[PDB]
Amino acid sequence: IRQNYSTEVEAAVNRLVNLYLRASYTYLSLGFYFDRDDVALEGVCHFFRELAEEKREGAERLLKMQNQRGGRALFQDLQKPSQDEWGTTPDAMKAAIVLEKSLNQALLDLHALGSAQADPHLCDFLESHFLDEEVKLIKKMGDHLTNIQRLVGSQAGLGEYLFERLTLKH
């Protein structure tokens, strides 16, 4: 069935799967960090546990597409998250933005590769399911970071609690 599907794109898709699964693992670690009894911000834990699910769904979508095109999924080891402890809510949100911008750059790099290989199905796939989702998420995180930094500028403890209660918790 394989048609117009380069080995370069096939390999890049496998690398992107690894990146999405790595991101999901990072968000799992963020979520459980905020579930610690000495951290205890349920809204923040929920926000990150939801993102862990969204990243896993992205990997799954890439894998389904890989098979649709007749490429072969190849899994690699998943690196552990970059930190064991994630600091304050603004620290964590900054780390999440860095992470999402790195995924976004990988998406843009793959889109450029597909464009060079004249693979319009790949380009459409990324546009339909990834590019706008990423931009929306990065905007949301940037808005959150602005709100948290505004809050913790005034008084740190009070600010983090108010943000978790009035923006994140549902």
Residue 16, C-beta contacts closer than 8 angstroms, at least 6 positions apart = 62, 106, 107, 110
Q: What is the DSSP letter of 52?
A: H
Q: Is the Cβ–Cβ distance between 141 and 23 less than 8 Å?
A: no
Token output for 110: 């793959």
Site string for its own copies, 10-29 (x = CB under 8 A): -----------x---x--xx
- Identified binder of its own copies from the candidate list 8, 10, 15, 35, rule CB under 8 A: 35
Least distance in angstroms from the C-beta of 165 to its own copies? 4
CB nearer to its own copies: give 8 or 49.
49
Site string for its own copies, 43-62 (x = CB under 8 A): --------------------
C-alpha dist (Å) from residue 23 to 4, 54, 146:
29, 10, 22
Q: Is the Cβ–Cβ distance between 143 and 135 less than 8 Å?
A: no
Q: Is 10 a known ligand-binding residue?
A: no
Contacts to its own copies from residues 101-130, by CB under 8 A? 101, 104-105, 108, 111-112, 115, 118, 120-121, 123-128
Least distance in angstroms from the C-beta of 16 to its own copies? 14
Least distance in angstroms from the C-beta of 108 to its own copies? 6
> Residue 52: phi, psi to the nearest 5?
-60, -40
